[model samples]
Target: ASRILLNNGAKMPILGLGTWKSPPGQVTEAVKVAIDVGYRHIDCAHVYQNENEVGVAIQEKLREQVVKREELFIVSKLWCTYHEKGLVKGACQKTLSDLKLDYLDLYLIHWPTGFKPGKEFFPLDESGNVVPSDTNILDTWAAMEELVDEGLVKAIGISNFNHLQVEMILNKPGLKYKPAVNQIECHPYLTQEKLIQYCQSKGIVVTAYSPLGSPDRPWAKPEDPSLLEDPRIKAIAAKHNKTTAQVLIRFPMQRNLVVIPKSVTPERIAENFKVFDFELSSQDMTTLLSYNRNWRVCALLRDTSHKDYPFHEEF
Candidate 1:
């Protein structure tokens, strides 16, 4: 498995298995099959609500000596509701307990905006709109810094943040450490070239989620553009004698970006990992980049009004 050196000296697998939208019923077996097929990085989150199943598979693998604990790089996130004053540790603990692990390889602030803390993850008001919390991202980040000090997480990061939001954290006074990574939706549709390059220039690694374009995403509309079914990608894959999925997966890696494409199907899971066997020529790479439409798969439209809401600036 190829690895990338994080800003904090930790080695993260360049290719990982994303767990979002992975069904609860099949996720355990999916995780097992992934590990058996040599996947070392698994991305999880409290919001996914399938960590218990994922944990069972990991524990079984470890108990049977299929893989040692140190060999896996598990990443989890602090959900938006937990960005409250001192709830960060408790939130991280819940995710740790759910995953049945003592520490996380990386923990990310799930999004820049916070939600009003309560039993509901969304914390909706009377009108069914998301209630944005007044908690500042700096406070949440400070608590994240404490996670590193407390030994609960190896590295810390932010997700769904635009360029200015990242700069806000980077420019924080007395910053103890640089963010290890900035994870966002990236594909031929949303190339994010400038954002990726900006993060890399500041010593932060980039992780591309929805690399195959998140067809199963909950908010997906029937008429939405499908990255996998696009003829342009199919043409490129045919030229290389590879599957269109393989072409999409390899596109980001050529730019030194970490990609986590989710698949619960055993055959597809194994197929996605075969990207290391080939490389795209510079011309094809540019052709893929040309498909950039600045399209976003996971646009949380309701929360765009929040003060701490990201994505407003030029990424």
Candidate 2:
């Protein structure tokens, strides 16, 4: 597997198996299949609510000597509800316990906006709106710094944050560690060129989630644009004798960004890993890059009212 060197001197696999919409009952077998197929990086999170199942697969693989603990780079995130300084450690610990690991390879602040803290993942008002918390992101970063200091997490990052939000963390007073990555939704339709360039210029790696446009996203509509079904991309794939999914997954990698395309289907899980064998020409790369229309599939529209909501920025 190829790897990228993070700002903090840690190496992360450039291609990881994303577990966002991966269901609990099937994720275990999916993870197991991924591990068997040479996937060392598993992108997971507390919000996914499948860590227990994911851990079962991880432990079983370790016990059977399929992979060593050191060989794998496991990642999880601290959910929005636990952004408060006092709640951070407990949240990380819960993920640690659920994944059955002593430490996480990387832990990310799930989102810039914090939700009301409680058992309810999405605490909502009677009017059907998400309740926001007053906790500041700096406080959350400070708490995240403590995790690194205590060796609970090997590295720390922020996901779904805009460049401005990332700048705030980078310029924080007495900052101990800079964010190692900014994982965001990236595909041909939403190229994020400027943001990716900005992050890399600041020594932060960019991880592309939804590289296949998140076709299974709950909010997806029949009329919405599909990255996999684009005729231009299909032509490019046909020329290379590759699947459209392969082209989409390879696009971000060629741009030197990490990509985690989620999938539970065994055939596709194996097929996505075959990208390393081929390379796209500069012209083909540009063709894919031209499809950027700044489209976003995972827009957390409901949280737009929060002070920390990141998408308000142009980047």
Candidate 3:
């Protein structure tokens, strides 16, 4: 029941099922099982490489008449290597093919940076070095607009972009449409309060990825802090008779931002959807905001040196 309407009057669920880092064998049933439990929004990416299975689940749900395609909100992303003007539609086609869907509800640019277009997702030279492309994001965005015209996508947006990067797109000389949403890492640890406000000021909707702090991300270390285990969060959860995970997921919902929390486990997926029954108090919100350290768990530090690397400027 946690959902909101976008600038274009399209409905996007505030709480969605994220597909990143979901293991291969489980995503299919998890998706189907989720739909069975009343989940209408399924967030995915071609880079996640599990769309085929996810697609299968959706088809099953449709066959069962559990939910209509129009009732579902499905989103995908265009990868960095596909940022070239000519490669944009082809990449969208690939994602649509993988997901077995006619058109995506929303499509986003995966990152602001560009890698040389080719068969490889991360283009590399003979010496095992990464190749960076000079393709401007505007070039890729131009092609993205073409997707809406072709009816391949209902709307187009940006992801992992900083304030300046988004401003560049907004201020482009011949922009066709404003971005529908800006997907980024957001949680108690990295509140991104200012950035969310800036995007809202521009009439852009914000979607919070890694809303649970991404404790299961591949690069995570055993010593890394867990957002779900914080004592302050535990106290809040106790007051409301909810789990810490529910508290973390509800944090962004209270702020009018969309949140996608990924979990392949059936119980966890069901647990995440139970956020609608409770609301956080004003003091609870204040206590949670005080835990912000501007800390980010999914920092792409390796790509920081790139020319279009985001996170360099304070949002």
Candidate of highest lDDT:
2
lDDT of 2 by residue, 198-305 (tens): 999999999999999999999999999988999999999999999999999898999989999999999999999989988899999998989999899988887788
User: Residue 48 of model 3: what lDDT?
Assistant: 87
For candidate 3, write residues 1-315 as lDDT tens digits: 557878767888888899998887899999998898888989999888898989999988888899999999999999988888888899899889888899999999999989887778776678765578899988878899999999999989999999999999999889997899999999888888888999999988899998888988888887777788889899999999999999998989999999899999999989988999999999999889888888887666656667898887887
- State which candidate, 2 or 3, has the greater lDDT: 2
TM-score of 2: 0.98
Q: Sort by lDDT, best first: what order?
A: 2, 1, 3
TM-score per model over all chains: 0.98, 0.98, 0.97
Stretches of model 3 off by over 4 angstroms after superposition: 125-129
Instruction: Note each model's CA RMSD in angstroms.
Output: 1.0, 0.9, 1.3
The alpha-carbon deviation from the true structure for residue 286 of candidate 3, after best TM-score superposition, in angstroms, is: 1.6
Q: Give the C-alpha miss distance for residue 118 in model 1, angstroms.
A: 0.6
Residue pairs with backbone atoms closer than 3 Å in model 3 (clashes): none
**Model 2 lDDT at residue 71:** 86
Where is the poorest 10-residue window by lDDT in model 1? 302-311
- Report lDDT (Cα) of residue 111, candidate 1: 96
Q: What is the C-alpha local distance difference test score of candidate 3?
A: 0.88
Model 3 earns a TM-score of 0.97
Worst 10 residues of 2 by lDDT: 298-307
Clashing pairs in 1: none
Model 3: how far residue 188 lies from native, Å: 0.5
